[PDB]
Design an enzyme around this catalytic site. Sequence first.
Site, PDB file in Angstrom:
ATOM      1  N   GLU A  90       0.828  -1.201   0.000  1.00 51.96           N
ATOM      2  CA  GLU A  90       0.000   0.000   0.000  1.00 51.96           C
ATOM      3  C   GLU A  90       0.865   1.254   0.000  1.00 51.96           C
ATOM      4  O   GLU A  90       1.953   1.272   0.586  1.00 51.96           O
ATOM      5  CB  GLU A  90      -0.913  -0.051   1.235  1.00 51.96           C
ATOM      6  CG  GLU A  90      -1.555   1.272   1.669  1.00 51.96           C
ATOM      7  CD  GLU A  90      -2.163   1.175   3.078  1.00 51.96           C
ATOM      8  OE1 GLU A  90      -1.554   0.504   3.969  1.00 51.96           O
ATOM      9  OE2 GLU A  90      -3.253   1.743   3.288  1.00 51.96           O
ATOM     10  N   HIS A  91       0.427   2.291  -0.726  1.00 56.15           N
ATOM     11  CA  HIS A  91       1.133   3.565  -0.721  1.00 56.15           C
ATOM     12  C   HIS A  91       0.295   4.593   0.031  1.00 56.15           C
ATOM     13  O   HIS A  91      -0.905   4.705  -0.200  1.00 56.15           O
ATOM     14  CB  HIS A  91       1.402   4.084  -2.139  1.00 56.15           C
ATOM     15  CG  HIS A  91       2.219   5.337  -2.158  1.00 56.15           C
ATOM     16  ND1 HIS A  91       3.541   5.373  -1.750  1.00 56.15           N
ATOM     17  CD2 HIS A  91       1.891   6.605  -2.497  1.00 56.15           C
ATOM     18  CE1 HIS A  91       4.003   6.601  -1.889  1.00 56.15           C
ATOM     19  NE2 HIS A  91       3.021   7.367  -2.329  1.00 56.15           N
ATOM     20  N   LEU A  92       0.904   5.284   0.975  1.00 56.43           N
ATOM     21  CA  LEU A  92       0.205   6.320   1.719  1.00 56.43           C
ATOM     22  C   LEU A  92       0.611   7.679   1.178  1.00 56.43           C
ATOM     23  O   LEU A  92       1.774   7.875   0.853  1.00 56.43           O
ATOM     24  CB  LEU A  92       0.547   6.200   3.213  1.00 56.43           C
ATOM     25  CG  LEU A  92       0.109   4.800   3.636  1.00 56.43           C
ATOM     26  CD1 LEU A  92       0.918   4.237   4.776  1.00 56.43           C
ATOM     27  CD2 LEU A  92      -1.382   4.836   3.935  1.00 56.43           C
ATOM     28  N   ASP A 199      15.316   0.066  11.439  1.00 57.51           N
ATOM     29  CA  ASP A 199      16.001   0.983  10.525  1.00 57.51           C
ATOM     30  C   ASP A 199      15.326   2.340  10.584  1.00 57.51           C
ATOM     31  O   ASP A 199      14.927   2.910   9.553  1.00 57.51           O
ATOM     32  CB  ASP A 199      15.960   0.442   9.091  1.00 57.51           C
ATOM     33  CG  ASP A 199      17.043   1.082   8.198  1.00 57.51           C
ATOM     34  OD1 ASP A 199      18.031   1.574   8.755  1.00 57.51           O
ATOM     35  OD2 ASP A 199      16.923   1.056   6.938  1.00 57.51           O
TER      36      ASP A 199
END
Lengths: 291, 291
Positions: A90-92, A199
Amino acid sequence: AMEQLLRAELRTATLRAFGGPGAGCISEGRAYDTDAGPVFVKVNRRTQARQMFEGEVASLEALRSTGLVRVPRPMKVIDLPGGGAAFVMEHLKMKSLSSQASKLGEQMADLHLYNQKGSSYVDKFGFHTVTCCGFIPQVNEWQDDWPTFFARHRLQAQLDLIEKDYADREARELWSRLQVKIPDLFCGLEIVPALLHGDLWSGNVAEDDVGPIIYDPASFYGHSEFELAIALMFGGFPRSFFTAYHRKIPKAPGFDQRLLLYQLFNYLNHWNHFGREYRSPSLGTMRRLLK
Amino acid sequence: AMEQLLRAELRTATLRAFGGPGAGCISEGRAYDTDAGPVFVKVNRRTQARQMFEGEVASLEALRSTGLVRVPRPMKVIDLPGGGAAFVMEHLKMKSLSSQASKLGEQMADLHLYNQKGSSYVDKFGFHTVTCCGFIPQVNEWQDDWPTFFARHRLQAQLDLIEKDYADREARELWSRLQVKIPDLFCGLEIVPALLHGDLWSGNVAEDDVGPIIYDPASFYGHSEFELAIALMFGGFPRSFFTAYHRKIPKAPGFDQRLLLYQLFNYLNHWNHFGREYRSPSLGTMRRLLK
């Protein structure tokens, strides 16, 4: 103020930021609009790419399971003709971490306390699968003792790569001296395995209208303090992030010396990824730990 | 290629790459509205930022002087307190390249042919000022011979940085062998200097309702074919872009082998900018050329 400079140089009263992110960063991957919402795709044509991305899936799932932090949902790992794999998530819609920094400090402390405080306690350091730090696969073999885990499967691993690839005399000699002093930084302290993002560079955190977002994890169970080393050493987090975090997990005695040890790992990892620009901080950090 | 695979794997009718400039791997980028209209601003805090942006200004100006392709007007390069620079340019509303792909292929071919067909007299390879490959300043010293220019001021320059930062024995040994092979890849052809955009990744091309737009150039007079290597290797251009282009500039003999040599440059540049992940395709491309 860079906005004041732009207003002066362009002779304008208004300077209203607007608009979408653009094509992005060629080396990181690419976002696409689809029928069901935007996605982000990473591509790695190397043969170990599936193993890399499955580690990231495992990391995102572990973080999602806590319900404490917002991470992109993993969607698919695709094997590619010719070798390697793609990973779709998913891209936010996201902006730099700023207003949500104190909230993320709270969430990161809760994340680090989740294991100790919950119902199914992981009592060793390590992880159930391989995760990659950047491009380098890591050993996550479970270990009862954190200094043992960190010396063997983080610092020694990086130093073995440096010996293989650079044959660097000073790193070899300084490591033979430092290795034996590592337990002095942990004595008299209780160290509980903490689920880490792994990270938490400022370039791996952001925010939207709802709250902060973290991504590109390389998770394992570690000493909570290790999370903060890369955050501090490369900058980019508002002070209120660390203020909120340490209201919940105060700096234990010896925090600043352990901080050096943890920053050493990140410098060694950068020397193995990017080369000799990172030799001087690596050796310098070892020297600071020895005197 | 990748887009058809994503459409199938995600069962989506639409799939539209995010397009346009913005924050990349190297510089920050943001649009602003101002008293006089919108602008786009790139910011880089490194010491060489002014040089980089002055090279982009020169490249944009050279492309705009042809009247053959649309590119943002450069407006101002600004020194930042604390180091680095900001670069303001014209803002253009853009989406990723799709319906205008064949038109862009026509325009790029006409761009490359302009030095031969138009009132243009550049009969050496190189450029009148320094332009940067990302962070890396390039030598654009004029040279009569293209394989000499490309070997000395593109491939050797990248490999000298790889030697300095990684001291990689395989890269050094393979390059020495490949240097001997290079002239044979040119099939005795007479190469004509062509003005190149220089960084025609699909993330640096886009379109609006008037037609295609290109941006983020790093220009020089080179072999036309070099332009296509990054376009092909990272994908994102519809087939009709290449169909239209090669109707005007057919593939010369040896095109497929030179494509490897030109892609090698891009892999070396990614090794230098992004690290060890790109060692394997750099060495592998050299080995393929040596076979």
